[PDB]
Amino acid sequence: VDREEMIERFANFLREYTDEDGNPVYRGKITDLLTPKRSVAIDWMHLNSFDSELAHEVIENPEEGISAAEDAIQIVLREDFQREDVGKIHARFYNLPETLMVKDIGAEHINKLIQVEGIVTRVGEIKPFQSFRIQDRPETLPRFIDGILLVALPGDRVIVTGILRVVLEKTPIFRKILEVNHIE
């Protein structure tokens, strides 16, 4: 619900979630940061099985939900591993409950964390960002959306999560783009 509560609840999830074998998956993903990875990829269905309220909040209030998850990673690093100097670690959510085709993206998807399937038709770089043009896959027929990431090459089929942002496109319009939270 509120920010402080979400942080505490993410820390509990990271510490206490276990897979079908009783293994604390997210403890391992945290120790991967001490060798290193600079993200923790979180399976949303793991989160939903543990804390369905928190998982719903990630979808409906992504800016706050993602930020809280990141602050929880820092808390666990400090308290459980005595590390405070790893720097910013991104929380990257995948396996959301609904998947959109690019053509399905609408007004109802603003201000949410969304999951989109497509085929990559372009990949570019304008430092420090990577960009992807994500188009409807031919076997679903095309519309496209550009994604910005801070993994995939032209021709690759992908599933991405992210939040809709805009770019001023020069008649000028604010074209919807996706700020990418996770891609595979």
Numbering used by the authors: 1 to 35, 38 to 130, 182 to 194, 200 to 208, 214 to 233, 237 to 250
Paper text:
MCM proteins have three conserved domains: an N-terminal domain (MCMN) that mediates the head-to-head interaction of the initial double-hexamer; a conserved AAA+ ATPase domain; and a short helix-turn-helix domain at the C-terminus.
We confirmed that the deletion indeed removed the potential for the short intersubunit β-sheet interaction by determining its crystal structure to 1.55 Å resolution. Notably, the MSSB residues of PfMCMN-ΔZFD are positioned very similar to those of PfMCMN-WT when bound to ssDNA. The PfMCMN-ΔZFD and PfMCMN-F179A mutants are exclusively monomeric at all concentrations tested. All of these mutants (PfMCMN-ΔZFD, PfMCMN-F179A and PfMCMN-βT) have wild-type MSSB motifs available for interaction with ssDNA, but no binding is observed.
